[PDB]
């Protein structure tokens, strides 16, 4: 009750709804101490922990032949814009099995909707 | 160490607990009055009362779901037909516990548990 007052008053009301397994662009604010510039991060989301203000989602990228996993906070001010190009078709909330199988053999399908 | 944890063990594993409650839940609704120990009766309410609430609405899906518990068609048959209308106008508290002392064999806390009206 008392906690929810700070929860509602601090969350962002412009968070898009994205299904697990979709391709998501995340624009984050990076600071060198002097200037603020936007850094892009393209990858497929594999896990979403949507729980109030503490909501978070895990996205995975294959860069330079190496897999990198990064989590984001949906209500933190570090992110700037969340966009989705392709919507995946997987019947699982968690997509942790993508780590083992290689990317060329782990092509996800589209929901066609 | 039981911080905000619910669900008593009754010196049984998960399989025996589920079966014993399932057998006892069907026996209670069949007779409307059974005598069992206080801890067994107190955890039985967390089984039969949700089952009665599910039985408040009659549908093909609910009956099949209700059949998955108590694994007996006759128990499901009595539900949705007898205990449905009686508890339709009641919001919870379908069962009550009546303490009745202790057994002479092992000295255990004894208690009856029954429905609200029992139509008797």
């Amino acid at each position: 009750n008392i906690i929810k007052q700070l929860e509602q008053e601090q969350m962002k009301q412009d968070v898009p709804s994205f299904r697990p397994g979709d391709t998501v662009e995340v624009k984050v604010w990076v600071v060198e101490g002097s200037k603020k510039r936007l850094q892009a991060f393209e990858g497929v989301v594999i896990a979403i922990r949507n729980r109030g203000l503490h909501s978070a989602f895990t996205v995975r990228k294959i860069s330079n032949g190496e897999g990198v996993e990064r989590v984001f906070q949906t209500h933190s001010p570090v992110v700037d814009s969340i966009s989705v190009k392709r919507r995946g078709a997987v019947r699982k909330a968690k997509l942790y099995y993508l780590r083992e199988r290689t990317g060329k053999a782990a092509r996800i399908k589209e929901r066609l909707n | 160490m039981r911080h905000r944890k619910s669900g008593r063990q009754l010196n049984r594993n998960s399989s025996h607990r589920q079966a014993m409650f399932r057998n006892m839940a069907g026996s209670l609704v069949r007779h409307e009055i059974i005598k069992t120990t206080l801890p067994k009766a107190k955890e039985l309410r967390r089984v039969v009362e949700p089952l009665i609430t599910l039985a408040k609405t009659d549908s093909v899906a609910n009956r099949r779901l209700a059949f998955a518990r108590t694994r007996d068609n006759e128990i499901v048959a009595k539900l949705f037909n007898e205990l449905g209308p009686r508890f339709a106008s009641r919001a919870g508290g379908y069962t009550r516990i009546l303490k009745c002392g202790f057994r002479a064999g092992d000295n255990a806390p004894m208690a009856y548990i029954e429905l609200v009206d029992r139509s008797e």
Partner: protein
């Protein structure tokens, strides 16, 4: 400061006789800076003198460097001026580390 530190650093390095001054306008290829300057050092003592000169003038200018690396060894020393990284290195280090890739 922008588009002015580019000329400010070149002036400071050329004030202490830097050779073969090159400026790389890495606008988007690198995610840490906006432009880069690479300069040559005649000797080991010259490289340290160039690095100290550019750091000292930056403090008077109003920007504190984030750090330096090539202190003990003068083969290659870097200065972090915020949006600009300036490399001053010896004659040999500019070929072993080929900085035309970015």
């Amino acid at each position: 400061q922008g588009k002015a530190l580019q000329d400010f650093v070149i002036d400071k390095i050329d004030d202490l006789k830097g050779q073969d001054i090159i400026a790389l306008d890495v606008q988007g290829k690198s995610s840490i800076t906006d432009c880069m300057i690479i300069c040559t050092g005649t000797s080991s003592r010259h490289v340290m003198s160039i690095a100290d000169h550019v750091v000292q003038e930056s403090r008077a200018a109003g920007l504190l460097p984030l750090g330096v690396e090539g202190e003990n060894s003068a083969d290659w020393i870097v200065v972090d001026l915020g949006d600009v990284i300036v490399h001053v290195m010896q004659e040999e280090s500019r070929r072993l580390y080929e900085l035309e890739k970015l």
